[PDB]
Structures are given as C-alpha cells and as structure tokens.
Design a protein around this ligand. Sequence first.
Ligand SMILES: [Ca+2]
Length: 384
Amino acid sequence: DDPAGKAAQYHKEYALFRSANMPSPDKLATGVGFHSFRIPAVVRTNTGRILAFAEGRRHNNRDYGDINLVYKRTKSPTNNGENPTDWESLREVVGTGPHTWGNPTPVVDGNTIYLFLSMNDGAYSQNGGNTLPDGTKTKKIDSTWVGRRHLYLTTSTDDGDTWTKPVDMTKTLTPDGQAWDAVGPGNGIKLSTGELVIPAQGRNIIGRGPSGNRTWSMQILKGAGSEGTICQTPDGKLMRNDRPGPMGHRSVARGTLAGLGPFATDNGLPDPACQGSILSYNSDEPARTIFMNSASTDRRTAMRVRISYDKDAAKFNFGRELKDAPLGNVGNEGGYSSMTKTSDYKIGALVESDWYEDKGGEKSHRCIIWRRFNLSWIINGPNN
Ligand SMILES: [Ca+2]
C-alpha cells in the first residue's frame, strides 16, 4: 500500500486566468485584456514561489494573431498558491507587435528560470487563409525567415519578477528548412545528472553547463510528436510521452541523452490528440510519476490524473477523474494541462476550460483553472 493514501484527502480549485467574459477578468496594468487564456505552464522555483504561464489570446481563441505570453506568480515564496488572493496580478513576459508569442515551456535551473517559447509573425498561421481582426488573411507558415515558426528563450534570475528580452534561437535550436514548429508546451526538466531537457517538435533541446550558464543543443528524434512531454523515470532513463497525430492514445518512447528508442502507442493511455502533462513526483520509495491528460479517444473533457509506481512508468493506475472535484462558473473543464509539486506536498495543476459559447468557433472564451490536490485524493478515487 502507498503510505500517502492514509492521509486525509485534500483538493481545492479555482480559476486563475479569467477570460474577458468573466467577472474580474485578468488584464495587464496597461489595460490590455484577453478574450481567452490557453496553453498553461507551471513551475515551482527553488524559493517555493510558483510561476504560472499562459498564452493571452487578445481577440479570439485562435492559435494565430496577436497573442502574448503572460504570467502570474504567487505573492510570496511560502503561500503555495493556496487561495486566489495568494497570486499577483497578471504580468507579461513578451507581447511585442501583432505577433504570436506562446507555447510556454519553462524549466527551473537553480536560481535561473529558463522559459522557451514559440513565435510567429502576426501575418502568418499554421494553415494560412485565416481572417484576422483587421480583415486581412493570413499567409501559411512556411520555411522563410519571416514566415517560419521561431524558437525563443528568455530567462529570469530574480524568481520570475523580471525576464530578459527574448533571444531568437531558431538558427541553432530548430532544424534548418523547417516551417511549423512547437516547443512543449508545459515544462522541461532537470536531470539527476544536472542536464536540462526541453521537449519540442521532433526533438529534445538539451542544456548543458553550470547552473545558470547553459549552452543548448538539439537531440533529433525519429517518430516524435509535435507537442511532447519529457520525464526522467525512477530508473534514470528519459521518457517522451507525446500527443499523437491521430486521435487514440499517447505515443511513448524511452532512452537516454545518447538517444531514444522507437515511439509506440501506449494503449493504457487514451488521448484525443491533445496535449498532456507529466511530473516526476519523487524518487525515494515508493517512486511516483504523475500523468494528466483527457483520458478519452475523442474528447478533451475527460481529464484524469494518474500515478505510476513503475521504474520505467510502463503502467499507470486508473487514477482520478477531475470531475470528482468539479468547479462551477468556469465553463467546461478540459484540455491542455501542466503540473508542479508545491512546497507543501501537493500537486498543483493548471487545466484549460472552455465556455463553448460559439461551440468550436473562434468566439468561445477560454479560461484556466488552478487545482491543488494531494496524493491521497488521487489514490482514494472511487474507481482506483
Ligand atoms: Ca503580440
């Protein structure tokens, strides 16, 4: 038996990024508000402060157009994001121009937080032919310098308070000739041996060097997804657990910094072609890996958090459905997620929610929920 299961269950949940349609919507100090928030990423810093990132999509819920990378921090290093008033007001990492800034993918490295992100020129979209608010039609993302997806890196050495001007690393950390790209979204990791690993489309991005003074390289992968997760399992090996191209199940590969083995579908982890998140919770006995996604082959509204006790994370339990702790007044929960461990031995998770007013159309407002729960809450789930 898992000794953490004997504890009293704990869960608490509330909206952290409140869309423009909601009371007390999240706005920047400049007065800039956002139609939707999507694409969460969360990390605990070495002070205990929590940093929550998202895409602030200004005018509608689409992946293209004027989109800013925004964030909140907990007001103190010690409050663990317990209550809504424990969080600072909305701030911006980068929002310059009419461009798309997004795919936040942070990793904590001692006293430096690195944040990788994707960017495209505001006149371009993944598919092309999309209408922008001014009536212009996007061009299709292509392999030109202006028209491709870029990869940027920004850093903080003051616990997330301020961020360096993002540095364009496309020429060294994205393959030449590539058009569309993505990093994460969600999080990177620091290995037991001290290297940093950031998941990206078709590759890992590897940081080596002393803490806070890293240089970065690509590890090209065969058969990897566009939106990946990375994890160091208790056996010390790396694992990529990726969003599949076709709806069905997660696509998983295992290996080391010298290379990954083949990707293959994991039939224990249904997925509707959506982002997921993964977290190494602890390496001491019993070692646990936590996984969160929508546990369904066709919809995003079946959010499930699970534990694996396997050294290679081969098998996860049923876990618990997040609808067991439902939250009112935030739309229909489900979508992209990100998890961290808090200082008080909870899992903190950001989870997307959709008001669905325009159905799948661009006008449906999107918000992001902050959940905390302990292992007991997962372990003692009714179907677990
Ligand atoms: Ca912008």
